[PDB]
Ligand binder design. Structure first.
Ligand SMILES: O=P(O)(O)O[C@H]1[C@H](O)[C@@H](OP(=O)(O)O)[C@H](OP(=O)(O)O)[C@@H](OP(=O)(O)O)[C@H]1O
Length: 123
């Protein structure tokens, strides 16, 4: 079931704060928890119909983003839980994330392209 896991830094949506989060990529779904032993996902991002792209950030290096080619400037459909556990839809136009190192950043990038590609509903 698992495919790839490791820590990453992601920028919030409405509020632009980076949070260190544990990520798990599986079945073309990208999971992130606050801790590796967390029992439930803090957020879930369905990667279908999305694309990654290298970016340059003025605060964190080794970045890349997830955005929707088809609907530029439109909020990406995701599921997230608030601090208290309340379930809400995500509010990201793009998901910017900085890896700890280039090998990881690129390993994720490829690995995320691998899962999107291993999708029988690709266009
Ligand atoms: O705690 P503050 O400083 O308010 O910032 C939060 C965190 O960055 C959240 O990340 P995480 O959920 O990983 O803890 C993020 O939710 P997501 O990035 O998951 O959507 C929120 O986006 P908004 O709820 O859109 O503001 C953002 O407001």
């Amino acid at each position: 079931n698992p495919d790839r896991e490791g820590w990453l830094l992601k920028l919030g949506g409405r509020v632009k704060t980076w949070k260190r989060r544990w990520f798990i990529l599986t079945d073309n779904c990208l999971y992130y928890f606050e801790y590796t032993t967390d029992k439930e996902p803090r957020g879930i991002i369905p990667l279908e119909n999305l694309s990654i792209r290298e970016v340059e950030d003025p605060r964190k290096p080794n970045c890349f983003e997830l955005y929707n080619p088809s609907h530029k400037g439109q909020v990406i459909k995701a599921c997230k839980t608030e601090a208290d556990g309340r379930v809400v839809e995500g509010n990201h136009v793009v998901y910017r994330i900085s890896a700890p190192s280039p090998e990881e950043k690129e390993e994720w990038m490829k690995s995320i392209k691998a899962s999107i590609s291993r999708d029988p509903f690709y266009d």
